[PDB]
């Protein structure tokens, strides 16, 4: 299954995933292709921010759905 | 309730910016553009004070200037940033505790009355491209002491002039406490080297202008770590370096330094502020984490800015919003929520320091 991850700059990342993958697994996969530490990633879908412990299937994220990546501010 | 101050050189930058805008040669950043669009005057029809106030009004209650900004039109441009970093604000406050961070604060049995002067430090960190202050005080990545000196002189002197005068009017002297302004997050890569530069800058300012500060008596400088304890005589003034992690028993930022008391001195604390935020910054979201947020939480800063009457929580060291507000809006009821519900904006009187060292209206200083 492929899904997309769109960043603020409109750049689009392609990920290889399974419906049972957790949002935590997805963030880890984002770290692999992009080197962003997972605890800096907010993933948005369907107007919500997504919880690490739930699955893509939980959130009804299907093949070629697009997730939105927003980085954490950090002072 | 509060008073915005800025230097002569900052006024020149403002006049140049306003003229560039009037000519079409610059355009506002996103946040200033929003403030412009909510009022009716064109840039040209607006006086220099009104224009300055609208730029200051584009500040937001909380912003991390060191990481959250792009220094272009999508938030604040470099030209706006160069100005906003120079703007300071003072207010009289009630001080409910000594300013101790986290859990270490000591409540004043009788809350002290004094003043805060919020001043932003040199912004030498960025989540994107270089900042205006980096371009100002760095020579190919190396700190320039004279250039840093001129930056802090620009930003601190108008407040020293103000409180020198205010002490004279109250027939007292001034005791001023200063934290490690610009040595925290703002120092970015220069963290390990910045502290002697800031100390040197404070000394240089007091030394250069000793003749104009006869009512200033005690300067209590506390960068917490990384400096040696010292007292320097600067003219008639006593400049003290007392980093709290180095010198046990050091008096807090919100308390009278040794040799001062309320009968003989007014108490002023400098607050390490932020180019783009309201005074108190992250305490508007309820965080109590920086010099900016801790001192705002420990004073009635939020009441001075909003006009509301908060309540000091002795147990947690926080000045809380009005109790009616927290009941009605529990869950979305921090001070920044009070600002939204009440349509509060940050905008107040502004003066400039002229070439002779008098604080005057922007119009008066511009015409001289
Ligand atoms: N929020 C900025 C903090 C940066 C830092 O940790 O400087 C020491």
Domain extent for A67: 2-71
Question: What φ, ψ does residue B125 adopt, rounded to 5°?
Answer: -135, 155
Residues of B in contact with A74 (CB under 8 A): 64, 67
Which B residues 328-367 touch A at CB under 8 Å? Answer: none
HEC states along chain B? Answer: CCEEEECHHHHHHHHHHHHHHHHCCCCCCHHHHHHHHCCCCCCCCCCHHHHHHHHHHCCECCCCCCCCCCCCCCCCCHHHHHHHCCCEEEEEEEEEECCCCCCCCCEEEEEEEEEEEEEECCCCCCCCCCCHHHHHHEECCEECHHHHHHHHHHHHHHHHHHHHHHHHHCCCEEEEEEECCCCCHHHHHHHHHHHHHHHHHHHHHHHHCHHHCCCEEEEEEECCCCCCCEEEEECCEEEEECCCCCCCCCCCCCCCCCCCCCCCEEEEEEEEECCCECCCHHHHHCCCCCHHHHHHHCECHHHHHHCCCCEEECCCCEEECCHHHHHHHCCCCCHHHHHHHHCCCCCCCEEEECCCCCEEEHHHHHCC
- Domain parsing of chain B, residue ranges: 1-368
Residues of A with CB under 8 A from a CB of B: 73-75
Measured between alpha carbons, how far is B164 from B158 in angstroms, rounded to an integer? 10
Measured between alpha carbons, how far is B317 from B92 in angstroms, rounded to an integer? 19
- Cβ contact B96:B159 at 8 Å: no
- Flag if A74 and B185 touch (Cβ within 8 Å): no
Nearest Cα residue to B184 out of B199, B194, B169: B194
B289 touches chain A (CB under 8 A): yes
Q: Going by DSSP bridges, is the β-strand pair B237-241/B173-179 parallel, antiparallel, or unpaired?
A: unpaired
In sequence order, which residues have a C-beta less than 8 Å from that of residue B65 and are 6 or more positions away?
B120, B123, B186, B274, B275, B276, B277
Q: Going by DSSP bridges, is the β-strand pair A48-49/B3-6 parallel, antiparallel, or unpaired?
A: unpaired
Q: Is the CB of residue A75 below 6 angstroms from any atom belonging to ligand 1?
A: yes
Q: Report the interhelical angle of B48-57 vs B8-23 (nearest 10°).
A: 90
The dihedral sign for the CA sequence B187, B191, B195, B201: negative
Measured between alpha carbons, how far is A41 from B158 in angstroms, rounded to an integer? 43
B72 CA to centre of ligand 1 in angstroms: 22
Measured between alpha carbons, how far is B187 from B201 in angstroms, rounded to an integer? 15
User: What CATH number is attached to the domain comprising A39?
Assistant: 3.10.20.90
How many domains does one find in chain A?
1
B114 CA to centre of ligand 1 in angstroms: 29
In sequence order, which residues have a C-beta less than 8 Å from that of residue B140 and are 6 or more positions away?
none
Encoded tokens for B82? 């160069």
* Start-to-end CA span in chain B (Å): 28
Measured between alpha carbons, how far is B106 from B96 in angstroms, rounded to an integer? 9
């Amino acid at each position: 299954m492929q899904i997309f991850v769109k960043t603020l700059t409109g750049k689009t990342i392609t990920l290889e995933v399974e419906p049972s993958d957790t949002i935590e697994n997805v963030k880890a996969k984002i770290q692999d292709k992009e080197g962003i530490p997972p605890d800096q990633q907010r993933l948005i879908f369907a107007g919500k921010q997504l919880e690490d412990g739930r699955t893509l299937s939980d959130y009804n994220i299907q093949k070629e759905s697009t997730l939105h990546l927003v980085l954490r501010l950090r002072g | 309730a509060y008073q915005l101050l800025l230097s002569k050189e900052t006024l020149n930058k403002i006049l140049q910016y306003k003229q560039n805008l009037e000519k079409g040669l610059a355009t506002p950043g996103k946040f200033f553009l929003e403030e412009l669009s909510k009022q009716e005057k064109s840039i040209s029809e607006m006086d220099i004070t009104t224009f300055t106030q609208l730029l200051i009004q584009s500040k937001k209650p909380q912003v991390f200037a060191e990481s959250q900004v792009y220094h272009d039109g999508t938030d604040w441009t470099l030209e706006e940033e160069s100005i906003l970093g120079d703007v300071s604000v003072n207010m009289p406050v009630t001080m409910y505790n000594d300013g101790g961070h986290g859990s270490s604060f000591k409540n004043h049995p009788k809350p002290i009355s004094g003043y805060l002067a919020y001043v932003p430090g040199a912004l030498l960190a960025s989540g994107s491209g270089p900042t205006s202050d980096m371009k100002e005080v760095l020579d190919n990545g190396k700190l320039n002491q004279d250039k840093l000196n001129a930056l802090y002189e620009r930003r601190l002197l108008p407040q020293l002039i103000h409180f020198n005068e205010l002490a004279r009017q109250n027939e007292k002297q001034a005791a001023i406490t200063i934290p490690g302004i610009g040595t925290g997050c703002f120092s970015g890569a220069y963290y390990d080297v910045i502290k002697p530069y800031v100390r040197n800058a404070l000394i240089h300012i007091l030394e250069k202008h000793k003749d104009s500060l006869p009512y200033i008596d005690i300067i209590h400088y506390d960068p917490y770590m990384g400096d040696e304890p010292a007292e320097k005589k600067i003219g008639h003034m006593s400049f003290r370096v007392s980093p709290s992690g180095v010198v046990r028993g050091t008096t807090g930022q919100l308390d009278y330094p040794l040799g001062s008391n309320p009968d003989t001195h007014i108490l002023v604390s400098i607050v390490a502020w932020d180019h783009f935020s309201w005074p108190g910054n992250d305490y508007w979201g309820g965080a109590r984490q920086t010099d900016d947020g801790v001192k705002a939480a420990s004073t009635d800063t939020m009441g001075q800015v909003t006009g509301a009457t908060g309540v000091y929580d002795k147990k947690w060291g926080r000045y809380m919003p009005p109790e009616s507000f927290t009941k009605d809006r529990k869950g979305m009821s921090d001070w920044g929520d009070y600002v939204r519900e009440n349509g509060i904006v940050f905008n107040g009187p502004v003066l400039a320091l002229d070439k002779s060292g008098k604080l005057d209206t922007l119009e008066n200083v511009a015409s001289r």
